[PDB]
Design a protein around this motif. Structure first.
Motif, PDB file in Angstrom:
ATOM      1  N   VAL A 105      -4.793  19.561   0.714  1.00 48.29           N
ATOM      2  CA  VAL A 105      -4.301  18.306   1.472  1.00 48.29           C
ATOM      3  C   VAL A 105      -3.212  17.701   0.797  1.00 48.29           C
ATOM      4  O   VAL A 105      -2.983  17.690  -0.638  1.00 48.29           O
ATOM      5  CB  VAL A 105      -5.567  17.282   1.507  1.00 48.29           C
ATOM      6  CG1 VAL A 105      -4.985  16.020   1.930  1.00 48.29           C
ATOM      7  CG2 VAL A 105      -6.589  17.613   2.396  1.00 48.29           C
ATOM      8  N   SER A 106      -2.100  17.828   1.736  1.00 43.29           N
ATOM      9  CA  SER A 106      -1.023  16.992   1.231  1.00 43.29           C
ATOM     10  C   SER A 106      -0.581  16.182   2.262  1.00 43.29           C
ATOM     11  O   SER A 106       0.107  16.627   3.348  1.00 43.29           O
ATOM     12  CB  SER A 106       0.374  17.939   0.630  1.00 43.29           C
ATOM     13  OG  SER A 106       0.717  18.561   1.888  1.00 43.29           O
ATOM     14  N   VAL A 107      -0.311  14.788   1.908  1.00 43.71           N
ATOM     15  CA  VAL A 107       0.128  13.956   2.938  1.00 43.71           C
ATOM     16  C   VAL A 107       0.864  12.599   2.269  1.00 43.71           C
ATOM     17  O   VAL A 107       0.178  12.166   1.387  1.00 43.71           O
ATOM     18  CB  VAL A 107      -0.738  13.313   4.190  1.00 43.71           C
ATOM     19  CG1 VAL A 107      -1.853  12.553   3.493  1.00 43.71           C
ATOM     20  CG2 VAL A 107       0.006  12.776   5.254  1.00 43.71           C
ATOM     21  N   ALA A 108       2.106  12.241   2.607  1.00 45.12           N
ATOM     22  CA  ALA A 108       2.607  10.861   1.798  1.00 45.12           C
ATOM     23  C   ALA A 108       3.358  10.405   3.076  1.00 45.12           C
ATOM     24  O   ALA A 108       4.048  10.590   3.838  1.00 45.12           O
ATOM     25  CB  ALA A 108       3.627  11.366   1.044  1.00 45.12           C
ATOM     26  N   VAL A 109       2.843   8.987   3.206  1.00 41.66           N
ATOM     27  CA  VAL A 109       3.542   7.954   4.114  1.00 41.66           C
ATOM     28  C   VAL A 109       5.048   7.612   3.738  1.00 41.66           C
ATOM     29  O   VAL A 109       4.584   6.479   3.048  1.00 41.66           O
ATOM     30  CB  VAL A 109       2.690   7.072   4.653  1.00 41.66           C
ATOM     31  CG1 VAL A 109       3.148   6.141   5.511  1.00 41.66           C
ATOM     32  CG2 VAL A 109       1.201   7.554   5.255  1.00 41.66           C
ATOM     33  N   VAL A 113      -7.933  15.513   8.412  1.00 40.52           N
ATOM     34  CA  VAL A 113      -8.077  14.862   7.446  1.00 40.52           C
ATOM     35  C   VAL A 113      -6.671  14.033   7.027  1.00 40.52           C
ATOM     36  O   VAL A 113      -6.622  12.788   6.639  1.00 40.52           O
ATOM     37  CB  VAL A 113      -8.277  15.760   6.064  1.00 40.52           C
ATOM     38  CG1 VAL A 113      -8.004  15.002   4.847  1.00 40.52           C
ATOM     39  CG2 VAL A 113      -9.596  16.149   6.242  1.00 40.52           C
ATOM     40  N   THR A 121       0.349   5.520   0.418  1.00 38.23           N
ATOM     41  CA  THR A 121      -0.527   6.778   0.665  1.00 38.23           C
ATOM     42  C   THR A 121       0.493   7.673   0.334  1.00 38.23           C
ATOM     43  O   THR A 121       1.381   8.226   0.666  1.00 38.23           O
ATOM     44  CB  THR A 121      -0.697   6.446   2.167  1.00 38.23           C
ATOM     45  OG1 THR A 121      -1.315   5.548   2.600  1.00 38.23           O
ATOM     46  CG2 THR A 121      -1.441   8.011   2.376  1.00 38.23           C
ATOM     47  N   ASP A 122      -0.114   8.328  -0.818  1.00 44.22           N
ATOM     48  CA  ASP A 122       0.568   9.716  -1.212  1.00 44.22           C
ATOM     49  C   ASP A 122      -0.755  10.584  -1.929  1.00 44.22           C
ATOM     50  O   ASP A 122      -1.239  10.135  -3.095  1.00 44.22           O
ATOM     51  CB  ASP A 122       1.580   9.707  -2.685  1.00 44.22           C
ATOM     52  CG  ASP A 122       2.221  10.757  -3.043  1.00 44.22           C
ATOM     53  OD1 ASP A 122       1.778  11.828  -2.676  1.00 44.22           O
ATOM     54  OD2 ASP A 122       3.390  10.621  -3.721  1.00 44.22           O
ATOM     55  N   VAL A 123      -0.973  11.354  -1.325  1.00 46.14           N
ATOM     56  CA  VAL A 123      -2.326  12.124  -1.564  1.00 46.14           C
ATOM     57  C   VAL A 123      -1.820  13.790  -1.667  1.00 46.14           C
ATOM     58  O   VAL A 123      -1.326  14.514  -0.630  1.00 46.14           O
ATOM     59  CB  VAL A 123      -3.328  11.978  -0.405  1.00 46.14           C
ATOM     60  CG1 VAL A 123      -4.421  12.946  -0.368  1.00 46.14           C
ATOM     61  CG2 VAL A 123      -3.662  10.544  -0.369  1.00 46.14           C
ATOM     62  N   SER A 124      -2.369  14.281  -2.774  1.00 43.72           N
ATOM     63  CA  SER A 124      -2.254  15.844  -2.828  1.00 43.72           C
ATOM     64  C   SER A 124      -3.778  16.015  -3.665  1.00 43.72           C
ATOM     65  O   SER A 124      -3.964  15.639  -4.722  1.00 43.72           O
ATOM     66  CB  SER A 124      -1.111  16.207  -3.731  1.00 43.72           C
ATOM     67  OG  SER A 124      -1.434  15.871  -5.249  1.00 43.72           O
ATOM     68  N   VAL A 125      -4.498  17.080  -3.056  1.00 42.23           N
ATOM     69  CA  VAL A 125      -5.733  17.451  -3.383  1.00 42.23           C
ATOM     70  C   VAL A 125      -6.069  18.696  -2.946  1.00 42.23           C
ATOM     71  O   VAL A 125      -5.998  19.210  -1.628  1.00 42.23           O
ATOM     72  CB  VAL A 125      -7.013  16.500  -3.375  1.00 42.23           C
ATOM     73  CG1 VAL A 125      -7.238  16.347  -1.960  1.00 42.23           C
ATOM     74  CG2 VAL A 125      -7.967  16.955  -4.354  1.00 42.23           C
ATOM     75  N   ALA A 172      -5.128   5.413   8.577  1.00 40.18           N
ATOM     76  CA  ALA A 172      -5.430   4.559   7.737  1.00 40.18           C
ATOM     77  C   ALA A 172      -4.393   3.524   7.302  1.00 40.18           C
ATOM     78  O   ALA A 172      -4.283   2.171   7.474  1.00 40.18           O
ATOM     79  CB  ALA A 172      -6.356   4.796   6.483  1.00 40.18           C
ATOM     80  N   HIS A 173      -3.304   4.275   6.909  1.00 31.59           N
ATOM     81  CA  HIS A 173      -2.159   3.581   6.429  1.00 31.59           C
ATOM     82  C   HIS A 173      -1.369   2.568   7.719  1.00 31.59           C
ATOM     83  O   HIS A 173      -1.165   1.442   7.384  1.00 31.59           O
ATOM     84  CB  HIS A 173      -1.026   4.564   6.078  1.00 31.59           C
ATOM     85  CG  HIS A 173      -0.029   3.819   5.190  1.00 31.59           C
ATOM     86  ND1 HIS A 173       0.136   3.803   3.808  1.00 31.59           N
ATOM     87  CD2 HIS A 173       1.101   2.957   5.430  1.00 31.59           C
ATOM     88  CE1 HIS A 173       0.985   2.962   3.286  1.00 31.59           C
ATOM     89  NE2 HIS A 173       1.795   2.540   4.370  1.00 31.59           N
ATOM     90  N   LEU A 218       0.751  -1.192  -0.190  1.00 27.70           N
ATOM     91  CA  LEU A 218       0.163  -0.054  -0.027  1.00 27.70           C
ATOM     92  C   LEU A 218       0.852   1.321   0.125  1.00 27.70           C
ATOM     93  O   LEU A 218       1.669   1.491   0.710  1.00 27.70           O
ATOM     94  CB  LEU A 218      -0.883   0.019   1.203  1.00 27.70           C
ATOM     95  CG  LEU A 218      -1.834   1.326   1.338  1.00 27.70           C
ATOM     96  CD1 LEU A 218      -2.759   1.356   0.334  1.00 27.70           C
ATOM     97  CD2 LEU A 218      -2.606   1.310   2.628  1.00 27.70           C
ATOM     98  N   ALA A 277      -2.536   1.534  10.227  1.00 28.53           N
ATOM     99  CA  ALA A 277      -3.723   0.464  10.616  1.00 28.53           C
ATOM    100  C   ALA A 277      -3.386  -0.815   9.519  1.00 28.53           C
ATOM    101  O   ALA A 277      -3.369  -1.956  10.054  1.00 28.53           O
ATOM    102  CB  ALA A 277      -5.224   0.740  10.441  1.00 28.53           C
ATOM    103  N   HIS A 278      -3.252  -0.370   8.199  1.00 30.13           N
ATOM    104  CA  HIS A 278      -2.841  -1.391   7.240  1.00 30.13           C
ATOM    105  C   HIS A 278      -1.711  -2.367   7.762  1.00 30.13           C
ATOM    106  O   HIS A 278      -1.652  -3.378   7.737  1.00 30.13           O
ATOM    107  CB  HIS A 278      -2.806  -0.901   6.031  1.00 30.13           C
ATOM    108  CG  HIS A 278      -2.341  -1.797   4.847  1.00 30.13           C
ATOM    109  ND1 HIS A 278      -3.233  -2.745   4.238  1.00 30.13           N
ATOM    110  CD2 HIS A 278      -1.165  -2.271   4.419  1.00 30.13           C
ATOM    111  CE1 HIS A 278      -2.534  -3.350   3.302  1.00 30.13           C
ATOM    112  NE2 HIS A 278      -1.184  -3.264   3.531  1.00 30.13           N
ATOM    113  N   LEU A 295      -5.658  10.093   7.473  1.00 30.01           N
ATOM    114  CA  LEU A 295      -5.075   9.262   6.058  1.00 30.01           C
ATOM    115  C   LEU A 295      -3.802   8.396   6.547  1.00 30.01           C
ATOM    116  O   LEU A 295      -3.642   7.248   6.209  1.00 30.01           O
ATOM    117  CB  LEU A 295      -4.658  10.162   4.969  1.00 30.01           C
ATOM    118  CG  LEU A 295      -5.995  10.604   4.360  1.00 30.01           C
ATOM    119  CD1 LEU A 295      -5.897  11.931   3.379  1.00 30.01           C
ATOM    120  CD2 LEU A 295      -6.968   9.597   3.721  1.00 30.01           C
TER     121      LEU A 295
END
Ligand SMILES: [Fe+3]
Ligand SMILES: [Fe+3]
Ligand SMILES: [Fe+3]
Ligand SMILES: [Fe+3]
Ligand SMILES: [Fe+3]
Ligand SMILES: [Fe+3]
Ligand SMILES: [Fe+3]
Ligand SMILES: [Fe+3]
Ligand SMILES: [Fe+3]
Ligand SMILES: [Fe+3]
Ligand SMILES: [Fe+3]
Ligand SMILES: [Fe+3]
Ligand SMILES: [Fe+3]
Ligand SMILES: [Fe+3]
Ligand SMILES: [Fe+3]
Ligand SMILES: [Fe+3]
Ligand SMILES: [Fe+3]
Ligand SMILES: [Fe+3]
Ligand SMILES: [Fe+3]
Ligand SMILES: [Fe+3]
Ligand SMILES: [Fe+3]
Ligand SMILES: [Fe+3]
Ligand SMILES: [Fe+3]
Ligand SMILES: [Fe+3]
Ligand SMILES: [Fe+3]
Ligand SMILES: [Fe+3]
Ligand SMILES: [Fe+3]
Ligand SMILES: [Fe+3]
Ligand SMILES: [Fe+3]
Ligand SMILES: [Fe+3]
Ligand SMILES: [Fe+3]
Ligand SMILES: [Fe+3]
Ligand SMILES: [Fe+3]
Ligand SMILES: [Fe+3]
Ligand SMILES: [Fe+3]
Ligand SMILES: [Fe+3]
Ligand SMILES: [Fe+3]
Ligand SMILES: [Fe+3]
Ligand SMILES: [Fe+3]
Ligand SMILES: [Fe+3]
Ligand SMILES: [Fe+3]
Ligand SMILES: [Fe+3]
Ligand SMILES: [Fe+3]
Ligand SMILES: [Fe+3]
Ligand SMILES: [Fe+3]
Ligand SMILES: [Fe+3]
Ligand SMILES: [Fe+3]
Ligand SMILES: [Fe+3]
Ligand SMILES: [Fe+3]
Ligand SMILES: [Fe+3]
Ligand SMILES: [Fe+3]
Ligand SMILES: [Fe+3]
Ligand SMILES: [Fe+3]
Ligand SMILES: [Fe+3]
Ligand SMILES: [Fe+3]
Ligand SMILES: [Fe+3]
Ligand SMILES: [Fe+3]
Ligand SMILES: [Fe+3]
Ligand SMILES: [Fe+3]
Ligand SMILES: [Fe+3]
Lengths: 169, 169, 169, 169, 169, 169
Positions: free
Chosen positions: C75-79, C19, B73-77, C26-27, B71, C29-30, C23
């Motif tokens: 929103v900007s986030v990267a694990v 937010v 998680t890389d999120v930009s919006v 969620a990661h 998995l 947790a996985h 996220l």
């Protein structure tokens, strides 16, 4: 609508594989309880034995009645060595379930190659159950790397055998 | 049974798309109620937001645990412009859902190309939900071409949010 | 009754923080389930993810509709690295929850400085939930210093996820 | 996401086939009761008529509303000769159901060729129902080779019309 | 008690008319929902389709079994132009129902002329249902002259489809 | 209290016999339904298959866990010719059940010769079930000499599969 002999052979192969696995797991279940002192591991592996010897084979037999394929019963299996400990025992079950996934993959591929969409439909149950069964087995393997205490593990297994994911059943 | 990296990448792409859509719809829902005075349109779009950020992403994460995929998680919006009115707002939601259908189509095509029948199985949920979600969204769009009265529309939307087709769920 | 822009900015900051935490959890947790073999730690951290992405953000959005503040979605986030083990994983969650408490403190202080008593009222939920969430997370951390057996810990976590203090909720 | 005209044509063909079969079976049902003195054979064939004229056509019409395909109603059918006896009557029904299976196979094959995964999904119902319907019809045919007594057969048919296989529905 | 061939022909004509109307209404129902955005008008017209293709034809077939008349299935119908709007669509349904009344009138007149009192009895259902069906259809037509708002109309239609007059059923 | 190897061998022989019979009956059940058109004969023989592969083998495995005997899984069975008709099919089942009675007799005799009273106790279940199973099978055989009508027979078998004698279970 003439039935595919290639599919007929593969599905008879898969039938034989589920009968023989079922008999091997019946034995592994006995050993888990008896020699390894892990009766809940035994019950988990016994349920897997009854799954393989039940619907896994009944659906193939039922499918053949509907489409004209012929059922073959030819069964040879001997449990000649036991894995050395419970961790190796459930690790062995895992390896065999992983091969289940490989065999049903070949069946789906064949059905598409044969334009046998009823057989592609029918195999979707086995495509799904290959991962389901593997996941259940994997849930137990993980226990043997999380605790050195067989009674701790045994108690966790018991809660596991005492539900259906929306996709994987 | 070695997991496909192509499928792993596409499904991480799809994961990111459902998280980011979910966040955009959360914003559109706020705007529908607040600026457009349409709280039931807001509730419809808020349910869609929670769908995208819930099972749409949870199944992918769950699928990865089972097969060894990783998995990401890389999120930009960023919601930098709002559509000008509610009709344009729900029309925008429609356009994005239509792209959902295009993306999952590419995933099914890839899985067949990769002989990844477990991934073809898994994607069938998303193949089905692409049309379901689009239909629900289309049901609302149609309202804006059937009435000039936002309270009439709002009342119809409320009955819509207060059932599963046999095929499309 | 003109809305405070300082409060508007801080609360949009807090929205973005909930937010993005959601996220990240969620990661985590996985990873807790998948790589660390601790599915109950996963369920605990997944519930925390849904808390952050649910009411923690919904109340801010709801509050803005009522008072004229504008919602911003950026929103900007990267694990990009995972903690090395489960103890470090839940210890990380703890550190972030401790920063939640610091951020909401600054918001309460600002609201009093601005004579924004509706915003001071509204933040009391977050003042209270900062300690609640931290306590729940702390309950799990303590387990990793009380047992070397991940199955023992896992069983305790499961009873924890299967009630509201009069003051702290 | 532009709809396939090839699929549109095939599915309109399949729609027409289910309407026309439905009308032929309505007639065969009347003849089974009236001239052949077998009212339970009539009820079995009447249920099949209502199946073909109901969901078999409703799902296609419903599918078109969702994806932009156009529905065509062009129907020509005349029952100009009756089979000579009940055995030949139900044998005729069997032959037509066997062609149903061939037609839906061609539709699944086309959908894969067109990369129309929503249409491949949708057709799986018809892939499954082709065998289901054929099996139900085959259950009756077998009766005419097991007894010379039409009242014996009739009594067995009545128990058959007074349940869903896990795979075939 | 020899059955009237004139009545046999007229009633086979009426059978054919109810099958073909039923198929036309199935199409009109699809168009009402799909192109006209009026799914409740669609449900009203779909219920009318199932009425025509159900008991309206089943009673004739049942009547023939009892008296020796022969059933004929000869069906040709093609929906080659659609009315331009929903008002014209339901107005078209009205015109066809008005012709139903004219056809059953001719059947009653014939039965009296033939001294076929069982056929005069049997037709009384159709004499009554001609007006019933026309009234239900008229209830909808009136809506299109009472409102310019298709959502207003749609809401009224929905209450209409969610009882039996003492005389007209 | 050292376990008898003679008894251990005989009981492993009996285990193998119940597994292999169970697999043969699974096949005979398929043939009874499929080729012989007798699905109720199939259900009767399928229940017998599950009896042999279930408790008949589970009690032996359970007995071994308790007393130190070792379980052996060595299984070879191939269904290479089918009886020519259903009467011969159920007559074959009868012959095999009659040999079951002979084998368990030898086991009881051995246990007395060995002064293994726990094994004599344990075998009493199998002494009793040998006659029970034979009687149930005999009830079906008799049907084939009482009627020439396979549907008559089939109906009687169905009532038989839709209770425990005080002595014989
Ligand atoms: Fe295989
Ligand atoms: Fe035990
Ligand atoms: Fe299971
Ligand atoms: Fe067969
Ligand atoms: Fe061990
Ligand atoms: Fe091909
Ligand atoms: Fe399974
Ligand atoms: Fe414990
Ligand atoms: Fe417990
Ligand atoms: Fe408990
Ligand atoms: Fe995507
Ligand atoms: Fe509101
Ligand atoms: Fe939904
Ligand atoms: Fe993972
Ligand atoms: Fe607006
Ligand atoms: Fe290929
Ligand atoms: Fe969805
Ligand atoms: Fe209203
Ligand atoms: Fe209203
Ligand atoms: Fe209302
Ligand atoms: Fe209401
Ligand atoms: Fe903050
Ligand atoms: Fe899990
Ligand atoms: Fe909570
Ligand atoms: Fe706002
Ligand atoms: Fe760890
Ligand atoms: Fe002050
Ligand atoms: Fe919280
Ligand atoms: Fe415990
Ligand atoms: Fe407990
Ligand atoms: Fe407990
Ligand atoms: Fe067709
Ligand atoms: Fe009758
Ligand atoms: Fe049916
Ligand atoms: Fe259409
Ligand atoms: Fe006949
Ligand atoms: Fe291709
Ligand atoms: Fe069907
Ligand atoms: Fe009888
Ligand atoms: Fe009966
Ligand atoms: Fe009965
Ligand atoms: Fe007429
Ligand atoms: Fe609709
Ligand atoms: Fe009605
Ligand atoms: Fe007739
Ligand atoms: Fe219109
Ligand atoms: Fe007269
Ligand atoms: Fe009517
Ligand atoms: Fe209402
Ligand atoms: Fe109401
Ligand atoms: Fe034996
Ligand atoms: Fe059957
Ligand atoms: Fe029994
Ligand atoms: Fe043992
Ligand atoms: Fe036979
Ligand atoms: Fe002695
Ligand atoms: Fe028995
Ligand atoms: Fe009877
Ligand atoms: Fe009976
Ligand atoms: Fe009975």
């Amino acid at each position: 609508m003439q039935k595919s002999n290639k599919i007929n052979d593969a599905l008879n192969q898969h039938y034989k594989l589920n009968v023989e696995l079922g008999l091997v797991y019946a034995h592994y279940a006995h050993v888990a309880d008896d020699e390894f002192d892990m009766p809940y591991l035994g019950k988990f592996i016994q349920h897997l034995s009854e799954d393989k010897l039940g619907v896994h084979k009944e659906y193939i037999s039922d499918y053949f009645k509907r489409n004209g394929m012929k059922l073959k019963t030819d069964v040879s299996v001997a449990v000649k060595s036991i894995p050395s400990d419970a961790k190796a025992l459930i690790q062995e079950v895992y390896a065999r379930e992983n091969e289940v996934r490989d065999h049903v993959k070949a069946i789906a591929k064949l059905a598409l190659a044969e334009d046998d969409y009823e057989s592609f439909y029918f195999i979707q149950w086995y495509v799904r159950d290959g991962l389901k069964d593997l996941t259940e087995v994997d849930d137990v393997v993980k226990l043997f790397n999380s605790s050195n205490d067989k009674l701790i593990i045994e108690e966790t297994i018991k809660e596991m055998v005492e539900s259906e994911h929306e996709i994987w059943g």
